[PDB]
């Protein structure tokens, strides 16, 4: 069943924040899937990233930052996140955690 | 054989032209390096331990036109350090053996008076 909390983030810098965030949620018992901490090596990552967003994810957490919204590979996880949100009739699905100091609710994507 | 004094030993080398085509036993013993002429040289110290032998040591001496020796020890040392790169194990062995064979008086030895 979908009982996993997906996390999207920029690949190079967001790791620090997400790593702390991922471990705390795991320590609280929240099942978490991070694209660097739970992705097996040699897998077809989009095949398993897309599949789990559709099927494994019950919440979608976006580490929002000045580059995490300009990153092509993250918006793709957002774009599928909106679609799975529609079928799941859950408006409280995408939770855009804002971390960057300079990002203030005025350059965020309309999604 | 023309003598070149060392610090604490005695070196011996061939003046250019003394050998036939400045070489012996098909091994060149006097040659040319750029503007200077290199001369293969030896120094002998006879020892009775372990058993009576004549320890011979290889050297390289340098002259301007093959006639007179360069009077700068630093220049001579620098010229040799560069000339040493070219020569190899076989190159040193052949030169040493050919230079010794020149000393031969009879077929298989040579005598000291």
């Amino acid at each position: 069943a979908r009982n996993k909390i997906f996390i999207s983030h920029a690949a190079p810098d967001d790791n620090d924040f997400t790593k702390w965030l991922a471990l705390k949620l795991i320590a609280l018992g929240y099942e978490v899937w991070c694209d660097v901490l739970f992705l097996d090596k040699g897998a077809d990552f989009w095949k398993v990233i897309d599949k789990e967003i559709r099927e494994g994810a019950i919440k979608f957490l976006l580490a929002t930052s000045e580059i995490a919204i300009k990153r092509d590979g993250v918006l793709k996880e957002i774009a599928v996140a909106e679609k799975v949100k529609k079928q799941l009739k859950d408006d409280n699905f995408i939770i855009p955690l804002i971390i960057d100091e300079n990002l203030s609710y005025d350059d965020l994507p309309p999604e | 054989v023309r003598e070149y004094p060392m610090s604490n030993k005695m070196g011996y080398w061939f003046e250019k032209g003394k050998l036939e085509k400045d070489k012996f036993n098909k091994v060149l013993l006097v040659g040319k390096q750029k503007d200077k002429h290199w001369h293969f040289g030896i120094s002998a110290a006879g020892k009775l331990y372990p058993f009576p032998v004549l320890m011979i040591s290889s050297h390289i001496f340098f002259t301007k036109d093959g006639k007179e020796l360069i009077e700068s020890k630093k220049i001579q040392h620098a010229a040799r350090r560069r000339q040493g790169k070219n020569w190899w194990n076989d190159d040193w062995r052949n030169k040493l053996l050919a230079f010794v064979k020149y000393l031969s008086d009879d077929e298989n030895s040579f005598y000291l008076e």
Binding site: - | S58, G84, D90, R93, L96
Partner: protein, 452 residues
């Protein structure tokens, strides 16, 4: 027809006690005998020097490929070999301005010039050690070329000497070495070309840094237990001589312990390179007490070796202070008589490890030769062998040869295949060069980490 006996290569222990014959291969394959958690750098240089040092550290993070990878093994990367971390971002940098160096260099007194050049760096090092809470394991001194060439009562010797009372491991790295590409002799090519030997440079620098930071890259095991391999070196002071001793022995756990055994032993004599009975008795008592405290019981043999021959009086003193049940062997190792062996047909020198036995009391040993392991001979020209003479005592001339060859394999200052002369003698030489470069120390440190 003269017969040459052969002494086989000894094996040096690596991680988990695994054995190999090459440090450059044993480390890259197995790992160091003892692993450290990591190395906190410390740099005393300019902004240019700090940039160079950080560039070089990050460069040796990545694997280093030298031109002739087959003959000289490549460098996997620092953490890939030793297992610890050495980051270029953890630098406790202490800036040295070119202007203060300039005002030092303009002083008329050359001795005061070199003293002040040493004092600048050492006082900055001391200040950081006592003030910066940031723990620094090894202090890396990136010196510019002006220091090396203008200052020539030596910079390196005094600098290592004046830090001995504070016990601070240090590593001098001339910026010509780390930035060899951008140091050219106006021809457009580097002053000394490391291109084909970059990997071996990384090996040497990384091994030196790892050793000075508390790690043991490799240890020896192919030596006889119960024997204290002891080496003396005499250094000239101008009319005094200065004896320095280095000792290597196997412990209760069968672990080789290599440590210096130095005490002041100054002799002013017409007959040079000899010790008075008091100095010799002190020497030997110090070494025997060190072995006793390390292992409890006394050694079964005191294998004293040196580059000089012992006279009667000092040997009688040695025997007088020696307890019962312990034999003394005094061995003289000389490298002056030219016995150059040319191979009949070929182009590569005699193999390393060949030994010519003169008689029951002497031998020739080719500690330098052509090593098939690297396919690279240790000598460009014909290698002169070392003359090993059993000066005093009773010993087996082949056992002494294998013991000396084993002692030639513990040079931690360079990660070469093996040393031409036994390591105890070379490190005692370094100690003598350093311990005689400053004022007498009440108790010098007995760890080479502070000297090499």
């Amino acid at each position: 027809m003269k017969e040459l006996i052969y002494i086989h290569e000894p094996n040096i222990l690596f991680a988990n006690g695994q054995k190999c014959a090459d440090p450059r291969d044993g480390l890259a394959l197995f790992g160091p005998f003892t692993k450290i958690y990591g190395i906190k750098s410390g740099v005393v240089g300019t902004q240019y020097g700090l940039s160079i040092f950080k560039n070089y550290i990050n460069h040796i993070q990545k694997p280093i490929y030298n031109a002739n990878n087959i003959t000289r093994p490549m460098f996997p990367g620092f953490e890939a070999v030793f297992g610890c971390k050495w980051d270029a971002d953890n630098v406790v940098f202490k800036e040295v301005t070119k202007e203060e160096i300039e005002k030092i260099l303009y002083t008329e007194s050359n001795h005061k010039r070199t003293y002040d050049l040493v004092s600048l760096f050492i006082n900055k090092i001391i200040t950081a050690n006592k003030n910066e809470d940031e723990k620094v394991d090894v202090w890396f001194l990136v010196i510019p070329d002006e220091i090396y060439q203008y200052c020539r009562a030596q910079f390196h010797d005094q600098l290592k000497a004046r830090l001995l009372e504070h016990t601070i491991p240090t590593q001098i790295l001339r910026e010509s070495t780390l930035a060899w590409r951008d140091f050219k002799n106006k021809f457009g090519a580097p002053k000394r070309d490391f291109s084909k030997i970059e990997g071996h440079l990384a090996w040497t620098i990384s091994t030196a840094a790892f050793y000075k930071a508390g790690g043991k890259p490799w240890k020896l095991s192919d030596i006889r237990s119960g024997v204290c391999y002891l080496g003396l070196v005499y250094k000239q002071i101008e009319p005094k001589n200065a004896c320095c001793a280095a000792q290597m022995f196997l412990d209760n756990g069968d672990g080789t312990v290599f440590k210096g055994e130095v005490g002041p032993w100054y002799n002013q004599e017409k007959h040079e390179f000899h010790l008075n009975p008091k100095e010799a008795k002190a020497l030997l008592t110090q070494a025997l007490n060190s072995y006793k405290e390390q292992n409890g019981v006394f050694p079964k043999e005191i294998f004293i070796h040196a580059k000089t021959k012992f006279n009667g009086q000092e040997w009688n003193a040695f025997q007088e202070v020696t307890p019962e049940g312990t034999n003394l062997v005094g061995v003289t190792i000389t490298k002056t008589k030219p016995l150059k062996l040319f191979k009949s047909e070929g182009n590569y020198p005699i193999m390393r490890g060949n030994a010519f036995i003169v008689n029951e009391r002497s031998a020739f040993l080719w500690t330098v030769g052509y090593v098939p392991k690297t396919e690279s001979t240790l000598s460009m020209e014909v290698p002169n062998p070392i003359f090993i003479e059993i000066n005093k005592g009773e010993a087996d001339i082949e056992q002494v040869l294998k013991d000396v060859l084993a002692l030639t394999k513990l040079n931690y200052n360079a990660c070469i295949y093996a040393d031409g002369v036994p390591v105890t003698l070379r490190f005692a030489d370094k100690i003598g060069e350093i311990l005689t470069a400053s004022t007498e120390l009440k108790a010098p440190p007995l760890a080479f980490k502070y000297y090499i």
